[PDB]
Amino acid sequence: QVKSNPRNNLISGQRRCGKGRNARGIITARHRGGGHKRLYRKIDFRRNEKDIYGKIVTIEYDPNRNAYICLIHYGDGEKRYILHPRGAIIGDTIVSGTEVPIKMGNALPLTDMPLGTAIHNIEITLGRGGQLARAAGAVAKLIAKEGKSATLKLPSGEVRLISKNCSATVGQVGNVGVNQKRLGRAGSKRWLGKRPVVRGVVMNPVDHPHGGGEGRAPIGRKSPTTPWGYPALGRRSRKRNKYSDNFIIRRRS
Amino acid sequence: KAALCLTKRSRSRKSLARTHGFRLRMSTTSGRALLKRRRAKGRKILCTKTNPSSGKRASP
RNA sequence: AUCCCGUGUGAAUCAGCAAGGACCACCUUGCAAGGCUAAAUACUCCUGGGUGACCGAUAGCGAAGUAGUACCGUGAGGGA
RNA sequence: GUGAAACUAAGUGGAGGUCCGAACCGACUGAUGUUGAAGAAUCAGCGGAUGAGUUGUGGUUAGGGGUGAAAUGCCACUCG
RNA sequence: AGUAACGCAAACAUUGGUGAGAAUCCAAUGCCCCGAAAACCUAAGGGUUCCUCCGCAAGGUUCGUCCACGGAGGGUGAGUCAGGGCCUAAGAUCAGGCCGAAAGGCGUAGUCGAUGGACAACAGGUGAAUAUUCCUGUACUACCCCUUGUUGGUCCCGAGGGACGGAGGAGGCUAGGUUAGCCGAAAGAUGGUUAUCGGUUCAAGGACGCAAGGUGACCCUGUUUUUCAGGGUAAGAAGGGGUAGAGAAAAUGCCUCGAGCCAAUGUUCGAGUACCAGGCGCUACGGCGCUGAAGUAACCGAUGCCAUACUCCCAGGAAAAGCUCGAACGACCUUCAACAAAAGGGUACCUGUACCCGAAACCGACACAGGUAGGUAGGUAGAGAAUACCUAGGGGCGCGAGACAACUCUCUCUAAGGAACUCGGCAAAAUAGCCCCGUAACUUCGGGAGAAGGGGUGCCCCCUCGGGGGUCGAAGUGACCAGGCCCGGGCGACUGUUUACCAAAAACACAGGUCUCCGCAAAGUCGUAAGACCAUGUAUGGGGGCUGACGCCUGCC
RNA sequence: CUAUAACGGUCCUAAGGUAGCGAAAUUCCUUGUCGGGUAAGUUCCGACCCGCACGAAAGGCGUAACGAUCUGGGCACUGUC
Ligand SMILES: [Mg+2]
Ligand SMILES: [Mg+2]
Ligand SMILES: [Mg+2]
Ligand SMILES: [Mg+2]
Ligand SMILES: [Mg+2]
Ligand SMILES: [Mg+2]
Ligand SMILES: [Mg+2]
Ligand SMILES: [Mg+2]
Ligand SMILES: [Mg+2]
Ligand SMILES: [Mg+2]
Ligand SMILES: [Mg+2]
Ligand SMILES: [Mg+2]
Ligand SMILES: [Mg+2]
Ligand SMILES: [Mg+2]
Ligand SMILES: [Mg+2]
Ligand SMILES: [Mg+2]
Ligand SMILES: [Mg+2]
Ligand SMILES: [Mg+2]
Ligand SMILES: [Mg+2]
Ligand SMILES: [Mg+2]
Ligand SMILES: [Mg+2]
Ligand SMILES: [Mg+2]
Ligand SMILES: [Mg+2]
Ligand SMILES: [Mg+2]
Ligand SMILES: [Mg+2]
Ligand SMILES: [Mg+2]
Ligand SMILES: [Mg+2]
Ligand SMILES: [Mg+2]
Ligand SMILES: [Mg+2]
Ligand SMILES: [Mg+2]
Ligand SMILES: [Mg+2]
Ligand SMILES: [Mg+2]
Ligand SMILES: [Mg+2]
Ligand SMILES: [Mg+2]
Ligand SMILES: [Mg+2]
Ligand SMILES: [Mg+2]
Ligand SMILES: [Mg+2]
Ligand SMILES: [Mg+2]
Ligand SMILES: [Mg+2]
Ligand SMILES: [Mg+2]
Ligand SMILES: [Mg+2]
Ligand SMILES: [Mg+2]
Ligand SMILES: [Mg+2]
Ligand SMILES: [Mg+2]
Ligand SMILES: [Mg+2]
Ligand SMILES: [Mg+2]
Ligand SMILES: [Mg+2]
Ligand SMILES: [Mg+2]
Ligand SMILES: [Mg+2]
Ligand SMILES: [Mg+2]
Ligand SMILES: [Mg+2]
Ligand SMILES: [Mg+2]
Ligand SMILES: [Mg+2]
Ligand SMILES: [Mg+2]
Ligand SMILES: [Mg+2]
Ligand SMILES: [Mg+2]
Ligand SMILES: [Mg+2]
Ligand SMILES: [Mg+2]
Ligand SMILES: [Mg+2]
Ligand SMILES: [Mg+2]
Ligand SMILES: [Mg+2]
Ligand SMILES: [Mg+2]
Ligand SMILES: [Mg+2]
Ligand SMILES: [Mg+2]
Ligand SMILES: [Mg+2]
Ligand SMILES: [Mg+2]
Ligand SMILES: [Mg+2]
Ligand SMILES: [Mg+2]
Ligand SMILES: [Mg+2]
Ligand SMILES: [Mg+2]
Ligand SMILES: [Mg+2]
Ligand SMILES: [Mg+2]
Ligand SMILES: [Mg+2]
Ligand SMILES: [Mg+2]
Ligand SMILES: [Mg+2]
Ligand SMILES: [Mg+2]
Ligand SMILES: [Mg+2]
Ligand SMILES: [Mg+2]
Ligand SMILES: [Mg+2]
Ligand SMILES: [Mg+2]
Ligand SMILES: [Mg+2]
Ligand SMILES: [Mg+2]
Ligand SMILES: [Mg+2]
Ligand SMILES: [Mg+2]
Ligand SMILES: [Mg+2]
Ligand SMILES: [Mg+2]
Ligand SMILES: [Mg+2]
Ligand SMILES: [Mg+2]
Ligand SMILES: [Mg+2]
Ligand SMILES: [Mg+2]
Ligand SMILES: [Mg+2]
Ligand SMILES: [Mg+2]
Ligand SMILES: [Mg+2]
Ligand SMILES: [Mg+2]
Ligand SMILES: [Mg+2]
Ligand SMILES: [Mg+2]
Ligand SMILES: [Mg+2]
Ligand SMILES: [Mg+2]
Ligand SMILES: [Mg+2]
Ligand SMILES: [Mg+2]
Ligand SMILES: [Mg+2]
Ligand SMILES: [Mg+2]
Ligand SMILES: [Mg+2]
Ligand SMILES: [Mg+2]
Ligand SMILES: [Mg+2]
Ligand SMILES: [Mg+2]
Ligand SMILES: [Mg+2]
Ligand SMILES: [Mg+2]
Ligand SMILES: [Mg+2]
Ligand SMILES: [Mg+2]
Ligand SMILES: [Mg+2]
Ligand SMILES: [Mg+2]
Ligand SMILES: [Mg+2]
Ligand SMILES: [Mg+2]
Ligand SMILES: [Mg+2]
Ligand SMILES: [Mg+2]
Ligand SMILES: [Mg+2]
Ligand SMILES: [Mg+2]
Ligand SMILES: [Mg+2]
Ligand SMILES: [Mg+2]
Ligand SMILES: [Mg+2]
Ligand SMILES: [Mg+2]
Ligand SMILES: [Mg+2]
Ligand SMILES: [Mg+2]
Ligand SMILES: [Mg+2]
Ligand SMILES: [Mg+2]
Ligand SMILES: [Mg+2]
Ligand SMILES: [Mg+2]
Ligand SMILES: [Mg+2]
Ligand SMILES: [Mg+2]
Ligand SMILES: [Mg+2]
Ligand SMILES: [Mg+2]
Ligand SMILES: [Mg+2]
Ligand SMILES: [Mg+2]
């Protein structure tokens, strides 16, 4: 399950370092920092190399995502990491291409997938790489296809059109029990480098729109507010007219 | 555990001249304005924190 | 009004075009959308002469001697 | 122990924002100090001490800003 | 006002000496203090404070013959130590490139950038002031030089390697230490005594080597599985070879050969006419010349070494160069040219190097009761790097002398009482280690808990491997060191964080809960923009709002 | 029977405070009243409810462990007296 190997050439040390600091060096993305140094595994999300037969040699832990990852070999000696499908066991065999059996871990375009299939690691754009449903226990069903476009129900429940020629992988993403953990102590947050968050109501007026009323503050604001002055609850931020809109059918509920 | 006044500690000279050094003031426009106006006042010493790269005052 | 710029429209060639403090007629004056040009005028880190109902070491330049020095400041800077 | 399992001493094992306690980090009470030995200390006690730990060197973020386990705190004895 | 003070309560004393002058300068003899430093060394910093001679205006909280002060004159020696001539991290700059009134902003290759990777030296001697640097010994890197052997080498490129966490304990060892043995000296005016005092040291490096250590699959039988014993299986370990696919090396697949391997440490050379207790002689009485005995063994034993060796855990633990391997592509060079080797001789780039560095030299305006990374870690008692007393080494605090009032402060003790004190048991006193017995309500079943409470404890013999007997004392963990505890309630679950310098909490955080936004050219944040973060992530994820473990709940408008 | 009000009438609102707690870090009058602890108790504990002006994620009510927390009492101990 989790047994450490030596380092395959897929594990490097190069990476952004200040987490949450941008070019100007400012904290843009709050609360990061601290936490264990990690190494970046190079996942193969495109699965683009066609028509060769891969074998799952092992199953490895990855610090950068909550899913698992699988080291796979080929007859050609090339080694790749793929996201670990749910139920795949060492000794298993996977392949990608157009005309392919449909089993766990095989990747194919959406033209060839029988409606009703449960899919993960879904490209939205030809050859851009897989994007949708990569997290642990994430899965999306392929409901209907018509014309040049295929329809999925994403793990958020949102139904959406994509191109019929975009690759995707059969089977759900493994390590389903991950959100069943209970961290149990503060330190165990910090280990993940998620630093402590202050409630608005606490801070001084300069610092945040729920600023200190004498003892304890009800939020007198006629509305719950972002640090930056926007309504906190139920105000849709989706860009009104984005190109995406023609594709999107039903919105997540 | 140290007093407030202790702001200036023992800091490597290398580090300081990488901050207030000559070659630093030369880089920015604001620095060149610096050196013009020190030269105007006719100071004997342009960049107070400077440092030989190698020599008797060298930091390794 | 005259003048010059953003966005959009967009002329007329001397039987014209512009200006004469909205605008129109008449008369007068002028020729935009190519350039370049000396002097009379401004100034003192200074150079050479000259004068001073200007100072004379707490004055006159911060500085009549190591003076932007000593010293202070991480530094910009302060400064006898 | 039943056929599966549960249940229970035993040994092994060595988990823990575990315990006691020096270094180290702090700063709870008291006394002294108050033209101090010291622009925040000494003395006796006190808290943490494998962690959300301590620290070195080299870096980063700069004032309509930064950083903040949030005190208007801190940003060179200066900070509404 | 000739008043307060003279910067800790480590402590001085005397005899000589120098000198115009000595509580303070030098030496001797005592005494006292530090000894996980108040010792020795190194990073940073300082900058000549280092050493010698001269001086005593100013400085020095007194003095001064003295000095970190003033005047002169000196002093820092490296192929191997530390940086540079090597490599990259965070970060910085950034050709071209994108953006921007200007200045500039973003950013790719490149190039910088050690706190890390790589890379070769130790012992003894000299020594007014330097020493892994100079001397004498053995070493070791990198080049060059010749012989021999090959013909292509060199860079660009393909690869392997470099290359990595925490916690735990068990080994196997050294470093140190202690006691013997050997050697040399010993009479230290006392009742006895040699039971005493000194010595017993040696490095880098080179050759050898490895078990009672650690690793080397399974199956049957036994030793507790283990250390083992017999058999068998056929790669079954470090380690090598071959083959296959577009396929050189590599990776990958199939085949084969190997029972040993690993590395601290150890033996031997280095290494003795080295070093050294004493012995002899000189004394400018400071130091010097001369000859040198023994130089082994046992038991304790690391926080150091093997060691990134193991086992376990989740929070999943740098890059690049040197290095090893190698065909095609490209560039360049080519014969006594280049490369490959074991010897031999040769050859040897800059900069630091003084001194101080738990400090009177750095940081605190002071010769200031303070701050300042790292290294080395002796004795007796002790669990210990705590404490006490000491070694090595270093010190006696840059004002003294008296006297012994009030009073203040740092301390010891106090008859009878025992919180009557006071805002309040504030401060003091009390308790304390170790072994043995015993141990409640309550509970999230982990706790509570060292609960509470009780007993024992020195020194001798005897027995078993704890028990009995004796014996001192008023008192036996006799000093130092070393928990007061119980019964209630509020608040906050908890460890944490916080107002540097008047507030440490009931405030903040927190695990958990819940609402809402966000389909990836995401929402959100910062930018005039380019773009950056978010994220090299993708709804079991990312923003934001309130609440705050666990339990019972969360009503109406 | 004194009393109190389960029950009715009316008024006004978007709707009229349920569970649980309650002289509380909330209680003005107020050292409320009662009980306990003390020779004596404006604090403390338990309970009443007449909540000036509790109350359900600005969470309500419990709660083992924990605290240089706040607050009451007790043994030991003492120049605190
Ligand atoms: Mg790696
Ligand atoms: Mg590797
Ligand atoms: Mg920057
Ligand atoms: Mg919070
Ligand atoms: Mg506040
Ligand atoms: Mg602010
Ligand atoms: Mg902010
Ligand atoms: Mg506001
Ligand atoms: Mg408010
Ligand atoms: Mg209020
Ligand atoms: Mg200066
Ligand atoms: Mg005009
Ligand atoms: Mg006019
Ligand atoms: Mg204009
Ligand atoms: Mg126009
Ligand atoms: Mg025309
Ligand atoms: Mg006009
Ligand atoms: Mg005209
Ligand atoms: Mg014209
Ligand atoms: Mg015009
Ligand atoms: Mg013209
Ligand atoms: Mg012109
Ligand atoms: Mg004068
Ligand atoms: Mg003057
Ligand atoms: Mg005069
Ligand atoms: Mg602990
Ligand atoms: Mg504790
Ligand atoms: Mg603090
Ligand atoms: Mg203290
Ligand atoms: Mg302590
Ligand atoms: Mg402790
Ligand atoms: Mg731990
Ligand atoms: Mg610090
Ligand atoms: Mg903070
Ligand atoms: Mg406030
Ligand atoms: Mg300043
Ligand atoms: Mg300040
Ligand atoms: Mg303030
Ligand atoms: Mg007087
Ligand atoms: Mg007097
Ligand atoms: Mg006096
Ligand atoms: Mg004084
Ligand atoms: Mg003194
Ligand atoms: Mg002593
Ligand atoms: Mg010293
Ligand atoms: Mg020394
Ligand atoms: Mg140094
Ligand atoms: Mg000098
Ligand atoms: Mg000297
Ligand atoms: Mg003098
Ligand atoms: Mg004097
Ligand atoms: Mg003399
Ligand atoms: Mg001198
Ligand atoms: Mg970089
Ligand atoms: Mg730039
Ligand atoms: Mg450019
Ligand atoms: Mg770059
Ligand atoms: Mg460099
Ligand atoms: Mg280094
Ligand atoms: Mg080198
Ligand atoms: Mg070296
Ligand atoms: Mg010396
Ligand atoms: Mg030497
Ligand atoms: Mg020798
Ligand atoms: Mg060599
Ligand atoms: Mg390479
Ligand atoms: Mg490393
Ligand atoms: Mg060991
Ligand atoms: Mg030994
Ligand atoms: Mg003995
Ligand atoms: Mg004998
Ligand atoms: Mg005698
Ligand atoms: Mg002896
Ligand atoms: Mg050897
Ligand atoms: Mg050899
Ligand atoms: Mg063996
Ligand atoms: Mg090959
Ligand atoms: Mg081949
Ligand atoms: Mg191979
Ligand atoms: Mg032993
Ligand atoms: Mg340790
Ligand atoms: Mg490991
Ligand atoms: Mg070629
Ligand atoms: Mg070769
Ligand atoms: Mg030296
Ligand atoms: Mg030296
Ligand atoms: Mg000191
Ligand atoms: Mg002194
Ligand atoms: Mg001092
Ligand atoms: Mg010891
Ligand atoms: Mg003890
Ligand atoms: Mg012992
Ligand atoms: Mg001690
Ligand atoms: Mg001594
Ligand atoms: Mg006295
Ligand atoms: Mg005493
Ligand atoms: Mg008494
Ligand atoms: Mg008595
Ligand atoms: Mg009595
Ligand atoms: Mg009593
Ligand atoms: Mg009383
Ligand atoms: Mg009382
Ligand atoms: Mg009284
Ligand atoms: Mg007390
Ligand atoms: Mg006491
Ligand atoms: Mg006692
Ligand atoms: Mg007990
Ligand atoms: Mg208790
Ligand atoms: Mg007892
Ligand atoms: Mg007895
Ligand atoms: Mg309590
Ligand atoms: Mg109360
Ligand atoms: Mg708390
Ligand atoms: Mg802090
Ligand atoms: Mg404070
Ligand atoms: Mg506290
Ligand atoms: Mg305080
Ligand atoms: Mg706070
Ligand atoms: Mg949360
Ligand atoms: Mg966006
Ligand atoms: Mg709250
Ligand atoms: Mg009352
Ligand atoms: Mg009242
Ligand atoms: Mg009463
Ligand atoms: Mg009272
Ligand atoms: Mg009550
Ligand atoms: Mg109320
Ligand atoms: Mg209310
Ligand atoms: Mg409330
Ligand atoms: Mg409440
Ligand atoms: Mg609410
Ligand atoms: Mg609450
Ligand atoms: Mg409780
Ligand atoms: Mg605490």
Could you tell me the residue ranges of all domains in chain A? 1-95, 96-253
From the list A45, A39, A78, A44, the residue with the least C-alpha distance to A62 is A39
In the reported structure, the alpha carbon of residue A118 is separated from the centroid of ligand 91 by a whole-number distance in angstroms of 71
Name the residue type at position B48: T
Residue that is written with structure tokens 């392949």 in the block: A95
Distance from residue A47 (CA) to nucleotide E130 (C1'), in Å? 69
Q: Resolution reached, in Å? A: 3.2
Integer CA distances (angstroms), A131 to A123, A126, A140, B8, in order: 5, 11, 12, 53
DSSP label of A96: B
Quote the tokens at residue A245. 């809109």
Q: Is the CB of A220 under 7 A from strand F?
A: no
Distance from residue A216 (CA) to nucleotide E94 (C1'), in Å? 53
Provide the phi-psi class of A220: left if phi over 0, else alpha when psi is between -120 and 50, else beta: alpha
Which residues from the 1-60 window of protein chain B have CB within 7 angstroms of nucleic acid chain E? Answer: 1-6, 8-14, 27-29, 54-60
- Point out the nucleotide closest to A191 (alpha carbon to C1′): E315
Breaks (C-N over 2.5 A) in chain A follow: none
Q: From the CA of A40, which ligand is nearest?
A: 1
DSSP label of B31: H
Quote the tokens at residue A122. 């879904």
Number of structural domains chain B divides into: 1
Write down how long chain B is: 60
Say if CB A171 and CB A82 are below 8 A apart.
no
**CATH number 2.40.50.140 is the correct assignment for the domain at A1-95:** yes
Distance from residue A64 (CA) to nucleotide E542 (C1'), in Å? 14
Q: Exposed/middle/buried for A22, CB within 10 Å: 0-12, 13-18, 19+?
A: exposed
List the CATH number of the domain containing B50: 1.10.287.3980
Integer CA distances (angstroms), A21 to A160, A194, B4, B9, in order: 34, 14, 30, 29
- Point out the nucleotide closest to B15 (alpha carbon to C1′): D58
Using the Cα atoms of residue A33, residue A37, residue A39 and residue A45 in order, give the sign of their dihedral: negative
Quote the tokens at residue B19. 């901050």
Say if CB A121 and CB A45 are below 8 A apart.
yes
Q: From the CA of A205, which ligand is nearest?
A: 8
Quote the tokens at residue A219. 């939020």
In the reported structure, the alpha carbon of residue B39 is separated from the centroid of ligand 95 by a whole-number distance in angstroms of 66
Q: How was this structure determined?
A: cryo-EM
Q: How many CB atoms lie within 10 A of CB B35?
A: 15
Distance from residue A100 (CA) to nucleotide E20 (C1'), in Å? 118
Helices (H), A78-232: 186-190
Dist CA A181 CA A166 (whole Å): 34
Q: What range does the domain containing B44 cover?
A: 1-60
From the list A149, A152, A148, A86, the residue with the least C-alpha distance to A115 is A152
